[PDB]
Amino acid sequence: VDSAADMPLAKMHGAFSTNVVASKELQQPGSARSTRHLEIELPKEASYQEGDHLGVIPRNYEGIVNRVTARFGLDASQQIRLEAEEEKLAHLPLAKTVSVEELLQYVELQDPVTRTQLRAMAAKTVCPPHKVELEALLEKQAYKEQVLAKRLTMLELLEKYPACEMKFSEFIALLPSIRPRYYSISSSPRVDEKQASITVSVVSGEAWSGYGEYKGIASNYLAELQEGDTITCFISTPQSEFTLPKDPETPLIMVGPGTGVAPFRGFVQARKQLKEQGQSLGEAHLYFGCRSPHEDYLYQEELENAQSEGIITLHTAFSRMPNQPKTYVQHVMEQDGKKLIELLDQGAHFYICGDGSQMAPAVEATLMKSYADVHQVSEADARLWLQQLEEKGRYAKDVWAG
Amino acid sequence: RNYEGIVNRVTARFGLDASQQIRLEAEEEKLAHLPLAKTVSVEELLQYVELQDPVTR
Amino acid sequence: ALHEATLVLGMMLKHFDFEDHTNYELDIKETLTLKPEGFVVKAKSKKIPLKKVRKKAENAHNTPLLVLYGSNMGTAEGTARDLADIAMSKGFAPQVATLDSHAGNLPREGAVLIVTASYNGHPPDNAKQFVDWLDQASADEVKGVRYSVFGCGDKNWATTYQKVPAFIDETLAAKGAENIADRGEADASDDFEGTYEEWREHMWSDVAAYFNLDIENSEDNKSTLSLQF
Amino acid sequence: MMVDIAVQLVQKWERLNADEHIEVPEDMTRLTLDTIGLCGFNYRFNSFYRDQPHPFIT
Amino acid sequence: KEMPQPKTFGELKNLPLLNTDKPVQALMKIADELGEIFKFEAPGRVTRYLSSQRLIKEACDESRFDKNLSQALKFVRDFFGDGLFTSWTHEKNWKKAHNILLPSFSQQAMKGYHAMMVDIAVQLVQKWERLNADEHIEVPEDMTRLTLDTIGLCGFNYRFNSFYRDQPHPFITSMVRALDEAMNKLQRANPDDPAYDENKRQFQEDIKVMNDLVDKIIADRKASGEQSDDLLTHMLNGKDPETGEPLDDENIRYQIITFLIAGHETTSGLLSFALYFLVKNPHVLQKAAEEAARVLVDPVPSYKQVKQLKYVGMVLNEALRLWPTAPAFSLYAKEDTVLGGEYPLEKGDELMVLIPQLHRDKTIWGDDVEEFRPERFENPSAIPQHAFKPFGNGQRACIGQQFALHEATLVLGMMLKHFDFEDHTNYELDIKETLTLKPEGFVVKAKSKKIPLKKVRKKA
Ligand SMILES: Cc1cc2nc3c(=O)[nH]c(=O)nc-3n(C[C@H](O)[C@H](O)[C@H](O)COP(=O)(O)OP(=O)(O)OC[C@H]3O[C@@H](n4cnc5c(N)ncnc54)[C@H](O)[C@@H]3O)c2cc1C
Ligand code: HEM
Ligand SMILES: Cc1cc2nc3c(=O)[nH]c(=O)nc-3n(C[C@H](O)[C@H](O)[C@H](O)COP(=O)(O)O)c2cc1C
Ligand SMILES: COc1ccc2nc(SCc3ncc(C)c(OC)c3C)[nH]c2c1
Ligand SMILES: COc1ccc2nc(SCc3ncc(C)c(OC)c3C)[nH]c2c1
16 A cells, blocks of 8 residues: 655665655745755654754656756656666666656766766767867866866766767666755654654755756755655764753753754754753753844744743844844854853853854854963863863764755 | 546545555455556556446446 | 476476486386385586676786785784785786885885774784884875775774774875875774775776776776666 | 475485485485375474484385 | 692692593683682693683783694694694794685675575574474584584585484594594593504594595585685685795695684584573573564575674674683793793793683673673673683684674574574583583474464365
8 A cells, every 4th residue: 555666775774754744934035045844744663852863865856857858868757677787886676667757766866977977978979079078077187176176967968968879778877876865853852752843955056067057956855845745764863962961951052053053943842841841941042143034044933932931042143134244153152252161161061053164163263262262271272172072072063064 | 558537537536646656465366467566556557457347246 | 196296306307407327227126116226316406507606807917006904803904905806806916015014115106005903093013113104204205105095993992983094094195195095994883894895996996097997807897787678 | 395395305406516426216205205294294204304214214 | 929730649740630521611610719820730741721811911912922732732733734723823834824715704705605604504494494393403413514514515615415414424423533532632641551542543534534525525626617716716726925835735635624623613512502591591582583583684694684683793702701612722932921920931831721711700791700691792892802712812813703603693693583492401501522612412492483374274
């Protein structure tokens, strides 16, 4: 009954199949951007904790599947059968008949083009100047600057070179296996053990490669799901613990702008239940940042309510409010340095979630500088202080480049 | 092949989607020459059988 | 009797070739019942076919690949010698030795694969001279030396995970690196052959394109794909 | 159950080394006694685990 | 300090302490009595038995001590020659063979032995599946069938076909006789008394049976269209990167005998002790059986699946802790030196590491050292250096360690997946010594789990 393609990748992650119970937009009408909230049901066998991740096995969207079948002149529904004899991280159903469109849900279609991929294309190219160009891309410098820097794909090069005689079955076999995407669970199991939420910023823009419009695979897959759709996922627990202190009076500082708020929504929901069970709660500061309350102030109502019930103290920073300076969380943190550092001196835990490439480092630098200024010590002493804080388990990161 | 009209009458009667993948099993022989122990959509299962023979006892 | 005999003889005939190697002369033993006595044969399996791992390998012949190890219990040393064995298959002229025996004598030509463990944050006994030479001594710059580093570690060692390979890798670079292939790590506590495999395949290619890659080991992966129906 | 014993005979022979030989009626008796023992009586003489004939055969 | 010494017998000194069928167990009792170090003297000979990790960590310093041939090993060189096991570290043939044969135990080599290990393991599971109701299993006997066949097949493409034999294979009979004799020799005051003329004669005839089999393996291979990319391929074909030389014919023959014996006997012992401890520790058995079922989901185990059997691994290392099946190794002082700040040694002085006592050092392991608790090995990193040495030390450590463990883990995993075990005789541990250690008389019954089969149909 009822069974879906068991995917190797789904088996490797213990991903089970399950239903979407809610799916909705979090940004405001007329925002140029999208952030999604999805609620997912979990089977009896699965369970989770605050700071756990949802592993999502995504599907490739229609647009990009059609670009491939168009390039090869194939019908989506055309049944075919592969074979090699050779191993295959590309985790393809070999010696089975399977349509083109379903084969195309096993592979990554927009990873940068690899050197093996480029050689394969060069070898099937009967356009001499076009072969010279593909080979040019193999050189160390060109490969870094034109392939890796712009995320130029095999697919975009096949579209650029319609007389490259590569064939579908060689294409499919040269591609990497489809990878899971991780999302920070944004709910607490203390509210419903068998239901989990995620908070998904939708990747979208002009392709850095120059070939039209770019859409991030999992994020746009997730964005298009609706109540009653199924989804293949698993629970993943990160090596770096990202949980609330054992004692609910231990003070917390949380920094989580944008989708970085995600895991802190779980923290907030946990504290709220602990209160409802008579536990007393200490201070908890949430530094949240976004463009505008007219645009991307995710979970505003919930977070304002939480604050009203004494579950958190909320500090916002807005980058794009007319007639205000551009403000980021680290600017607010810096105003609050004295207080934040006293809290850490009394045993606070500090947490950062969200963007790991620019926001996290700048937040870290501001924390260390607040320390240095408050305790009149050097930057080296401030760095050692932070190192010790992390080694005590009191300085945790759930950040990503994505 | 069985035509769309008659395939839809079956999926409608059972409340099923054409594309719903499923897997059968028995242990017992089967002139009905069904792919058993394989996952296969409803609509394709329905191309293996006669849908308008008189009802048997 | 007939079902059994038919089944058995059928299987024997499917699975083997038979030889009457003694040119056996029928001698019929009587025990009221009858049976051949002394009848012997040899049976050559048809492996219903199996013969099948041998490489047309000619080895190590022919850019210079020096592989150095830092090892106390041989994990890193066997990995090193394995690499030198696959290099020979890829036409290189590989050389295997400990790390702290080429201390200062890094090859100014070809490439040098460096395979090493860590012990509580420290180099193995046969690698200490190398690292010390590397740490303080920097004067005798490491320019020209095109290398790559593979790390043997255990996640069970908290704060020291892969500290020596990391040290060597990044130190080698803050001294003039021709890092042709990004470092690789092995966690003994999980999937050491996965990572070792990832780093390796990526590795040969990095050095391939860079120059190499041509003294055996079909440039052709000679790997097929399937694409059947 | 016949297949069980027949697979035991094929395996013994698959597992001989080069130039080893097969004592035919001896091995056929291992197989036939075991086959009636197992099929008839759910009893295992285990004749392929013995280097001499089974005592019952002697 | 002056070191303790056990009871003496006039001019024979301690020699008669070895006039026993269980001399390692006797030595262990002496250690419990005398402590971390004792002197053992015979006419013309002295050695010092070490039992504490405190001293043994110093003995394991390769800059101060090298592998010695104990008396035991000197007697076994009579057939092991200058093979890897009985060669001195400074003999040219040691490093050459080490370098030539280490690649046979690489990860790729191990992967390539897997299929053949499975072949023999399936033969053992089948024998047991095919026993009748109430029949029993002679454990060390069957473990020897499996381990000898596994090294024969994986190492040499040679089939001993031990599961087609009702008695032990002839090679095993002469091996055991030869080891027994070497062991009995240890106590002999006058080894050239003509009373031992027959002993020597039986010894040579057993050496002959073992060498006749070696000759066959060599002949098969010369016939072997051979890629048989295995240990024998490396023996006949590999060159040492240092000297540039391959092994000569004489040494290869010693290697073959060495690997046939070292390559199975102690693995047989380990599996036997591991099954022993499981049946005596039903909660540990169940926890190991749970892992086997969970992990080994396919009809035959994969290589990656065997590597997944963590608890089974823990079980085996705990069996090796209590009863390391090669229970002693010997070292000599490379220069004058002081052990433990209290025991002066002169250059050439001999030490014996009494591995089962090391493995019972309460300062390392805690007070409960006699309990069988695989959980001790949950993080092997935690164990101090030189505390757990069932595979010897340094560059002279066991070459086949990974092979033995992979085989044992595979086999024990399969046994635990496929059967329930019963200690139906309530077996009392009795440890047979042949230099190596193994349970004697250990029997169990195995009830198949038909991994489930019992079928319906009707006789209605
Ligand atoms: C531990 C962890 C937790 C995470 N938690 C969250 C979370 O809670 N919520 C969340 O939204 N994400 C989270 N992420 C990121 C998330 O897993 C996905 O990486 C993200 O959704 C993008 O994947 P995707 O498949 O949609 O896009 P992909 O198809 O994988 O594309 C991603 C790549 O495209 C690049 N790219 C972006 N724009 C362009 C462009 N215009 N042209 C070309 N390339 C471009 C990106 O830089 C990135 O390299 C987390 C990641 C990690 C590692
Ligand atoms: C549990 C099983 C094993 C145990 C407990 C064991 C134990 C040992 C010990 C203690 C030594 C060092 C001896 C000394 O210092 O005198 C040793 C060496 C040796 N072992 Fe093992 N061993 C086992 C399995 C094997 C296997 C399977 C092989 C072959 C595949 C093998 C081959 C050898 C060899 C050849 C040496 C000598 C190595 C050298 O000095 O170069 N062992 N073994
Ligand atoms: C005493 C000891 C200390 C170790 N310390 C570390 C360490 O600091 N960092 C690490 O990554 N692994 C550590 N390891 C794991 C080893 O590096 C791992 O076993 C390595 O694979 C052993 O390689 P080798 O046999 O070549 O010496 C340690 C292992 C031991 C036994
Ligand atoms: C001179 O008298 C003789 C001699 C030989 C004989 N051989 C036979 S054949 C007799 C016979 N038949 C069938 C079966 C199944 C059987 O079971 C072992 C036996 C003994 N009768 C003889 C009579
Ligand atoms: C008193 O002298 C003794 C007694 C027993 C002993 N047992 C040993 S254990 C020696 C040993 N180790 C490892 C292997 C692989 C091996 O191969 C069969 C042997 C014989 N040495 C001893 C010395």
